[PDB]
Symmetry: D4
Subunit: 150 residues, 8 copies
């Protein structure tokens, strides 16, 4: 990757539906090359794919939660718990972090009932779970994970 690739990426991270001509015109390079570079980035694994950004509200996803989960120590409980949490429907993020040395789980549901049935009841039944604390998100100030180049 070179400074040119970064300029290309800084555009595709925002709008992947731009025309090669408009892009090639903004970055100042042969539209034929731009196409090559983009294809190269895809193969090299820089660009993993293209996604449609769907508005969660449009899907009635009104019950947004961020849950900290502590796992019991020993055997391979920690790793096992992480993968179980990642396969729960509605869960889009699972991170293991230092400090609280636990898992931070991001999920979205349409309502409290759905959250209870699909997420909480499932989590409460996992023996390896030492403690879980769910924080209800009441305001999304910002959520642009797609922006990696500031």
């Amino acid at each position: 990757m070179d400074e040119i690739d970064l300029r290309i990426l800084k555009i595709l991270q925002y709008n992947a539906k731009y025309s090669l001509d408009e892009i090639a015109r903004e970055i100042r390079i042969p539209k034929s090359t731009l196409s090559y570079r983009i294809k190269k980035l895809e193969k090299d694994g820089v660009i993993k794919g293209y996604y449609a950004y769907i508005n969660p509200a449009s899907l009635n996803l009104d019950y947004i939660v961020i849950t900290s989960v502590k796992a019991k120590y020993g055997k391979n409980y920690h790793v096992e718990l992480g993968n179980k949490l990642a396969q729960i429907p509605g869960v889009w993020g699972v991170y293991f972090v230092l400090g609280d040395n636990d898992f931070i789980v991001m999920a979205r549901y349409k309502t409290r009932e759905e959250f209870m049935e699909k997420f909480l009841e499932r989590v409460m039944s996992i023996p390896e779970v030492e403690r879980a604390s769910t924080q209800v998100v009441v305001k999304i100030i910002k959520e642009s994970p797609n922006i990696v180049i500031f």
Copy 2:
């Protein structure tokens, strides 16, 4: 939105680079209509846009952090603090949550130094901040915010 739109969205959320023919063939509808429905979803605000999914590692984003920030009470400190946190370079997520009644801030940096200079030093200088606790992410078990339809 109808059951057909959901089927279309369940595809575009994963791969927006599919061909209309392959999509129209999977859902079983006139490629001409599919195109109309997709265009409608865009105008109605369901599909807000299309983004390229860039691998953070490819950008050397190795210092990933999740920080809880508590704001001092009174005046309009809470709302002000939220917007200040959202404009910090590297910060892609800001949520106000109940429980700890604070802000959960998601950010990514290439190194500790960059994190300190761009994020921490900035946060430590904000007077409205009562307390901040940063959790270093050492393992991303899952991060697929694009998946809204399970």
Copy 3:
């Protein structure tokens, strides 16, 4: 339910011992209809019943407590613990809440001894209990659960 029912309910929630004439005169409708509406609300389940509001002090209920109880994870411990807590004499409120992801238990006793014997000793013997923290209420600033329409 219509705006008229709400006006009726806003009265019955405060004083269910009012005369139909005084009520019918305040809301401005045929006393015969008012009676019908009230009867309808009862059948439809809006009005579940009528209770006498007894002053706790009159019963020497001087030891008022609010206890947070955390349940151990696994099997069906959480649900089981909730129902056990609800059947303890003196306990009038049991809620499962997010944040501390535990149970908040409201109870009233005449003295510390009664609290110990009927509530605490019972709770300390429940194996599914991970931790319990009792907060002694020393001042009831307000307690009007009957007011649902402000």
Copy 4:
């Protein structure tokens, strides 16, 4: 108050809509006396009033919260904060408790938006507030404050 009054109260706390004949027949005393005793209890302040028990769901009160609020020390901040919390629409319970030496506030709202506008925004603007932690109630196992005699 005597053992007879307690038997009367144990009935009125459950159903104040019983007939004097049915009550007088259950307790075994002159319906004329029962009426006197009940009237006496009202004047002596034992029976403060009669209320209609309205089902919160019937009013779409789906966002139920229990919030702990800590007040800053000094002057008369504590007492002032307590009364401010009690006058917030939707708040039916306010207790000052030992342990966390703070206020436990019970409130009900129809939705998150209403909760934010009427309760949280109001609380976040109170300078005397040191910290507030809201626990979202996701399950009401039991809520019978009217039962004072077990």
Copy 5:
């Protein structure tokens, strides 16, 4: 007990080595009666005994600790743990309290080594102990348990 007994007690709690004449002269009553009242208080259990107040420093008791101990729930673990803590040499106070719903243990030792061997090692070996937190006392602002009448 009458106002006269309280005046007598308010003296004996401070200095039990006073002369009956000086006491009888301060309270204004027949030295013969004073003696009777004091004897009565002893039998009735008001005055449980007379102790010599020894200066802890004189005994090289330099390692003073206050430890909170949480017991595991179930069976009769709580009560058992309390009595075990009370029989540890050096422990003069054991209280079960609400809030942290645990035991507060007061002890005194000459040094850290003695504290470790006699108190901590013993406590760490008790299975019923869920958690223990020792606070080292570095300054005794006041310690007059003998004063019960202010």
Copy 6:
């Protein structure tokens, strides 16, 4: 102090109302000497005094509390707060401890009302107080501060 003084003290700490003959007979020394040693211990400050042990229940001291108080940093707030806490009627113990780096305050009152008026209201009005947490003692397993020699 020698081994003989310790034997004398081990007796006086339990019962200072023993007869010199019984003591001299138990320790095996001239009653005349025993008297000298005891007098020496008093002057040297080992024995600070003799107190009557009064049963708190006999004084209706039913509301027993242990409160942790955190002081604000700066100036001489810490030292000042300590002395203010020690002069509150009902407070018999005040210790500054490490760990929570705060004050542990022991007090006794006859009732909740008295506790509120004499202790809590006073503490809540002290500006230097950052936070206070009161633990209600519901069971005194052991309280023998007089025993310094085990």
Copy 7:
């Protein structure tokens, strides 16, 4: 040890590569004696050895951590856990402390990966571990353990 030894030590703790002449000249004593005193201190165990102070950065030790580890109670779990933590490669400090009544573990690694593989995975597999909380060091303001004489 005398005041002269302290002066010698105050030098050797900073720079053990000084010449006997320069040292003997600064302290004002026969270089032959200085040599004797130093040899005596070594045998008496005051000076345990001489070490080269290596700059951690020079070894790419960029992931510095301080971890609190709580051990389960009973048997000899506490002591066993302490020694296991001390034998983990990268761990240079292990202390058992009061307050949190746990272990504080100091370690250094070149990267997050190394930290995970050598330290965290190892710690997460220890059954005796109740909880562990790792604090990532982002700035070493001072680290001069060699200075014992200020």
Copy 8:
């Protein structure tokens, strides 16, 4: 630095008082070269110096503490507090860490009194300090900061 330098350093970190012949014989290289390499490491800053390892007990350093200090937010309070803590006599370690987002301070004193006068009183007077929590070290399982190569 090469594999040879590491072998040299792995020796000097343990015993810098070895003879060049013994070292040159263990690593298998010209004693003349070894000397050059060591001199190079010193200039390049790898070896910052040589220190005498003094046994803290030999200096009566019996009161060992690890203190967490939280700084108030705003201005440049954080950085200022860090340097103030580093200049306190007895303090050998100061680290700013993530998680608790505060300072971890390592210090050693001969007694509690010295700790109070030199460390605690000083820290309690710093206005920028929000909270400080001192953990008394009662057992040093391991303290070998000099070992950087395992």
